[PDB]
Amino acid sequence: TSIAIGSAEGFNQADKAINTAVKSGRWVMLKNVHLAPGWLMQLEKKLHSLQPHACFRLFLTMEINPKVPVNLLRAGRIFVFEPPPGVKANMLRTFSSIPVSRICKSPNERARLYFLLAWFHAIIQERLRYAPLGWSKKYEFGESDLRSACDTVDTWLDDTAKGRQNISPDKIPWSALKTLMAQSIYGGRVDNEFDQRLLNTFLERLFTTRSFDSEFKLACKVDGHKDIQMPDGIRREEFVQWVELLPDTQTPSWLGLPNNAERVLLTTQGVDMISKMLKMQ
Amino acid sequence: DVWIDVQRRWVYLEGIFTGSADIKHLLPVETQRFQSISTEFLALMKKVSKSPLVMDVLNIQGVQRSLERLADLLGKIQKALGEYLERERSSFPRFYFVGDEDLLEIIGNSKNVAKLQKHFKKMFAGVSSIILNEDNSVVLGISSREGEEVMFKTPVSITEHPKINEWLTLVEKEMRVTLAKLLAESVTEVEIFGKATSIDPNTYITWIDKYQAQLVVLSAQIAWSENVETALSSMGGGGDAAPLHSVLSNVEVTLNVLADSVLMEQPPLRRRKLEHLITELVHQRDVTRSLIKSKIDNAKSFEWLSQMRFYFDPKQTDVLQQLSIQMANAKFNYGFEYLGVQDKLVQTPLTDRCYLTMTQALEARLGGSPFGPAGTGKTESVKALGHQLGRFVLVFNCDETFDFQAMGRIFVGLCQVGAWGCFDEFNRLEERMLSAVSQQVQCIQEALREHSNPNYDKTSAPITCELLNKQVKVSPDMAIFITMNPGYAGRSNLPDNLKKLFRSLAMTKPDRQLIAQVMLYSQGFRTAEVLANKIVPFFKLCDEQLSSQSHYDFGLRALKSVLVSAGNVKRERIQKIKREKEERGEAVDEGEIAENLPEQEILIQSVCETMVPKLVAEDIPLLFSLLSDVFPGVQYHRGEMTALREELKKVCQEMYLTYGDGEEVGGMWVEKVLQLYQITQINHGLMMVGPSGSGKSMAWRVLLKALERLEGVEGVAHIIDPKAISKDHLYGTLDPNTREWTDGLFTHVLRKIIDSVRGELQKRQWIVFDGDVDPEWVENLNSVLDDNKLLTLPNGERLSLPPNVRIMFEVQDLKYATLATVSRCGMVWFSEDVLSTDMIFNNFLARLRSIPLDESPMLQIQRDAATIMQPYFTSNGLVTKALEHAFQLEHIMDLTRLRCLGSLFSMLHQACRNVAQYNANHPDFPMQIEQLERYIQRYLVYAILWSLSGDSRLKMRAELGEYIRRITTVPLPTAPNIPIIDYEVSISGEWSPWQAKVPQIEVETHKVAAPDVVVPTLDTVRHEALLYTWLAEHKPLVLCGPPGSGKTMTLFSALRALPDMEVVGLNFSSATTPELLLKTFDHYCEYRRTPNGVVLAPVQLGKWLVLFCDEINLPDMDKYGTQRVISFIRQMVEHGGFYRTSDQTWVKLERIQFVGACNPPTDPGRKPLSHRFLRHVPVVYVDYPGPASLTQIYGTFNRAMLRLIPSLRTYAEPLTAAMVEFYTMSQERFTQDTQPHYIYSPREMTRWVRGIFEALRPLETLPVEGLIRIWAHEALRLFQDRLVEDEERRWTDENIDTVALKHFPNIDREKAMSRPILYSNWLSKDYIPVDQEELRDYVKARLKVFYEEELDVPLVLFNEVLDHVLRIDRIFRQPQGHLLLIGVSGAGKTTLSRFVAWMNGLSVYQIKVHRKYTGEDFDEDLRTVLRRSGCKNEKIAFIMDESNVLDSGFLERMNTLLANGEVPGLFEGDEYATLMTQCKEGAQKEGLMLDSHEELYKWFTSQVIRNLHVVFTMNPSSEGLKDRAATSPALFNRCVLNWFGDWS
Amino acid sequence: YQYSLQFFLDIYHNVLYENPNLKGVTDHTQRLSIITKDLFQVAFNRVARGMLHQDHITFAMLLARIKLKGTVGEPTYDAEFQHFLRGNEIVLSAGST
């Protein structure tokens, strides 16, 4: 049972759902509970004096803000959701989120398109850490954009490939996908001409007929002369294995940024870690 | 006025109760009620029919009462039909968008279709009215607002479908079907028009005229899409000859025909059709050129797929499904909703991107959320896309009152109708409401998704969703769009779950050049590209180079208004040239006239009619330089509106205003009036921006009168102060329980105009918002100021702004208004230089020479005085030079020209009244012209001095007097050093010193330091005269100065000279609202319905009510710098009344005036008063009495005091000197910088004298040493009790000793000033000093008795306990003696207070605060305390703690009780009646025979003051003390503060 | 980062009992070593799940310090960690460089 917190009817429905679930054993999710900090204390007191069913689970979705009561935080288990630490983690999360049966469909080229989409999303989202250089402002490039891009890819691949097992890479609607990503999916959030130019550059570099060649370069000159290679696989599991075997030595040059784009950030983070460890001495 | 409303209500109520048959079962009781009421109504109608004479009907007994009762009963019945209204809305989905009153009218008038013709504009997109035959039994067709009409293929007959719902649904379905058939025929014709080398203009214009504006553009789009599809299919072979060039040629030749057609004169409907066709074909040409350039040969290429394409299938059986609209992978069906003639928007690439993103969102079954700055066309883009698909788009201007239930009801309406919802400013909702609404949006989207699944079949169960705990069917055509400005920080943030339900899009930079080019091309402007490429950069330069002002807007809206004005100006110029050629010669050629047509000066003329009025003086030459640079060699000359100028002249003469032409006096004001007229002509939303007293109100009033006299159209103005009332009272509120909508002020006014019961649509109606603008209330007018011209309420009701209504704002600044509202209103900038001082002088002199002061010898005196002061009221005169100099000085408040000018004018009116009084007192010898001249000149100098420097210190008053003496030629006093400010003007016409009015009096012994007693001083005699002068004309006035300066004392002494004037005390705090003033009005005044309107006047006939606001500048300023009560007072001063929120009725004040008091605005917690408020209120600075004045005042008090003991009469001078010196050093040493409560004033010295007098009263004899001991004891109790730190107390002790030895040298130290200075009347009858040991023994015995009889907790008697119990005993022995004990918890404050109350016989009362405690419980406790202490004559020690304060209302009520001794609004209704009864028995018991309620309440207040004692105990917090100093000023100026603190 | 005593007790219960690594191990000393290892592992896994990724390194550093204090065959390394934490508080001079 999903309930959005903020209205009196919402509070009554949440109380009724909790009272029903602690007996039946169902699940209850309450969204944006940080908007009612006063009611969270009463909810915690109600939860403490309670012996619910073994299968009952209560989920409280909230944003990280100090208005959430401390007693509620101590009573429950906290799970922080945030951008993945790196490109490898972002791609792994994207592949795990998308069902296996969705990627494995009638055209074998769908897996490569999904891998290109995952890499593009990882590159775009990881550049947001270097806010002034990777972009011009902290855009909300998130899971909704990835889902819309997946839907667009599925729709246009199904339109072009009418159930055929294989489709020529030149026959893939590259222009349709590129334009939709640049205008509606990811370019909708962009309100800067140069951010749009960068997005168009990324889309025209990644989504092209040359992406299906063995020589294709995901990134060029990550350090010295080494560069990231496009996988030669044609199936989802091979792409996932390639993602898992990433060097785990990521630098901002994976994103196209200079290697020195992270020096100030890393120095500040190290100083902040020193301060945090000293604060709990 | 009552008959028509009752008849109108009864018509539709009887219609509903008769036509409907299910209403008898659902709601029978009020059905029977209405049957009886209708029987009475029919009896009345029969009686009227017997004698149709008006006077015979008027002579019917109790006819007015009968009609009022009928109206009340009809209203009660009408409000009792909500469930039936919901039932009726359920059957026909479009009833969800119509109001409750309008639904009542619609259902009641089902039989009489005639009154439904103004209600179809609410349920349909473009259907304003329906077309019926003469029988009114068959619906032949429908009509639009512009007059365009559609005839049904098969007309719907009402007789065959008598039910309102049935025939309404048939009309809607037949409208859709006939639109489909007409579209099919139009496509068939345009196919013949298409694929043609040349187009005959005659047949093309015939086809355009034949079909609707909505259908011609659709047919053109269908034909172009089919042509492009066929051409691309032909090119599909690859490397083939391109027939796409033929399609481009066809588009170009058709556009050439359209341009030729728009060059000449066309009917307005055909002109709009041609404009829409041109706008669409420019986009078609651009798309075709883009297709050709890219070398596109496949019809499946995305560069063609991404475009919007229209496909028509003549083989489709369903005419509604014949047309399919596709763009990218999204496919839509035309809704075929009659849109009328809407304004098409140029299809800019941004609009294209918007179309693509929003259609992609629609296909994926989730809403679209365009965002960006205002003026980017986000809302318009959404409306244009909705109209392109033939959808019904409803626009809602969301605000914080759009709660979960209202938004859910709107969603239910949209789901059932199948309409589009464009929720503008969707982030103005509260975040909790956003989260709650996300649930409903998700359910609706899930229902749409399950509808879109191919497994679902329409023959199966209908798709329904859970909306407001009901099953609501969801039409597939429904869409949800939310447009918001994320940049606005105040706007609430959207939750992530709600944001994921919408597809966002950034609309930040509209393509202004394209829109300008296409708009000018469609209007017939040759060389439109050059004009656009000149005018868009010109707007950029205006934005950049011109100075930054808060009212400047050079965005798309400004250019859009400029372009439409250019089109209108070109049309008017064409008409003028045609009429000139008609009156001279007979040859007319439209082509030649258009060829030699100066379009550049037309564009510049529009720019000047729009940009120039808002320009500041320094920017007009700059903008004209920009015009010269961008458009060289062409000039614009403003039209000479002599017809309006003569009317302006007449109105100015009748209104005593100054008129001027060009560079004459008052010319700039007339130019501003003409600019305001132009902006009114070209806009429906206006703002008059400019500093206070720039002539804005007079400008628009004179404009309204001149327009009324010129055009013959009566003008009505509704002036509303938006910030004087809450937003709920301004716009309306929705009941969370019964879901009943109560109209606000603006909503009621607009609805009354729209309904037009008394022909309000035939009058020029101007709704003026004379008040501050903040983005809380003005953003609700966003949809009103937009083309939408619509007011959307949370209850789903939408009110269209009538074309005769103008929404005007009269503001002094726009520093808090956002660019959203600035871009939505034409601006006229009224600089202060527009209203020159010479014009004000001329207005004052004309009013004096014309308007009599009494209500003619008085008029003759006024004329003579005006003649005498005429030389001094000219430019570069005495008054003007003094005003220029006075602005260089600093004052206690910000100086404004009109405050000083109004003060001076009031003083001159007082001088004229004084001359009239002299003439009346000397009938034999009337005052001669030489005496009159001398008196008037001297009084003019005196009034200039007291008006231009009243709010400044004595030093600057002397400076202004010296400057006047330097510049004036009037004879002046020959005093070598005494300033002119120290002289008055005797009625004989000569200067006399104010010292002659200051006698050295000997106040009576029993009247020593009494509140009524006032020692006469130069400042007192000067301020009393000034206050009498200002109060005589009933002009509101403000006293400014330090606390205890004597402002209230000066005012009450001045009011004592006026016996026809009664004062009512009001004490404002930080939580003060106009509700306090309303309570005062209800208690002291009464509302009566005069024939001219409701008038509020005091109950006492012939008496003027003076409202004394004690602290006028404490009330909190909101985030946008506005005080609601200050705006309220400004409204009732400027406009002489306010608005009654109960019925939105204007109430005019009568015999009511206001007097304000306040500390200087630099003091903590004090906010500066608005310049629009200070304009009407003179400010006088009552400063602290100097050492000489203090020595004189308290010296007299001491001499009167020491007369009790003859042996001490020789010590009055040293005692007064010691008191003054110690008070001065204490004031200097302890300032408010250290602690908020460190305020020392003459009030401390008054207490000092009173305490010494009370100690000395019973003593028969007393040595000097005992007098010194009493003096030191009083000094300690007054100056050391409130001290916090121990060093401060040590300083006070040491300096008390030092002062006592300095001023009394020949006394012994130990006997008079032993450190344990303790005084008590417990051991003995008299207030003699007591030693510590015997006091301790007495307190021990009394504490044993206290344990035996009362609260039993053992206590320790140390020195501090004895001192504190003595202090509390001292306070409890005084009338209106309240306490403020500050110290840590558990220090004994409450226990000692209870012990002293038991000792002094007081009854301890404490409020029993619990969790469920609310304001009503506190009010009941206060009523109980007041009844016990004021009616039963019971001494009560009301002990209150800071923890008992759970609301600011607690503090406000306690502040009022502490200050006045009574709360005005506490006793109302039956409580007031029983209070008066109990007061009557109490007065009878006391021996007083009081008859009326006024003296009963006065006696009750006196009893409460005498008996009730309030003890406030709070912890010693730093910021809490400062907060209390502002939220409760009476806690610090009415309560004695003893700082207990922690135990030492 | 609000954690109660019951959270740590649950971690300790999940380490002592329901531990996959203790399915077929019978030696007491190596069982104790396995329990000690999984104590730190499970503590980090559970706590860092509700922690920002920037504080994961801080918590891991503190856990590593805790383990380092618990090893007999290791120097205290107190001065090194004091210089690592409060190193920047040493006052220097222009001529010192």
Ligand SMILES: Nc1ncnc2c1ncn2[C@@H]1O[C@H](COP(=O)(O)OP(=O)(O)OP(=O)(O)O)[C@@H](O)[C@H]1O
């Ligand atoms: N044409 C005129 N000639 C002379 N005096 C004029 C003229 N027009 C207005 N005045 C006077 O000058 C003053 C202008 O007051 P008005 O209320 O019009 O100004 P305002 O700028 O709208 O004021 P506020 O900002 O306080 O609302 C009044 O005293 C008015 O009578």
Ligand SMILES: Nc1ncnc2c1ncn2[C@@H]1O[C@H](COP(=O)(O)OP(=O)(O)O)[C@@H](O)[C@H]1O
């Ligand atoms: N493509 C367009 N063609 C013509 N006028 C347009 C276009 N886009 C916007 N406008 C005009 O711009 C002004 C502001 O549009 P509006 O929808 O209120 O903007 P926003 O959504 O940014 O507040 C209106 O006069 C509107 O008609």
Ligand SMILES: Nc1ncnc2c1ncn2[C@@H]1O[C@H](COP(=O)(O)OP(=O)(O)O)[C@@H](O)[C@H]1O
């Ligand atoms: N000429 C005077 N005669 C009598 N009392 C005076 C005189 N001048 C000042 N005072 C004293 O100054 C104080 C003014 O009190 P009040 O009128 O309440 O001041 P405010 O209006 O500034 O709060 C009183 O104690 C009053 O007795």
Ligand SMILES: Nc1ncnc2c1ncn2[C@@H]1O[C@H](COP(=O)(O)OP(=O)(O)O)[C@@H](O)[C@H]1O
């Ligand atoms: N001088 C004292 N001797 C004995 N008990 C005292 C003394 N002063 C305070 N108390 C104790 O303080 C408590 C009462 O606190 P109270 O006076 O109501 O607090 P507050 O000072 O905050 O008003 C009782 O326990 C009482 O015995």
Ligand SMILES: [Mg+2]
């Ligand atoms: Mg808008």
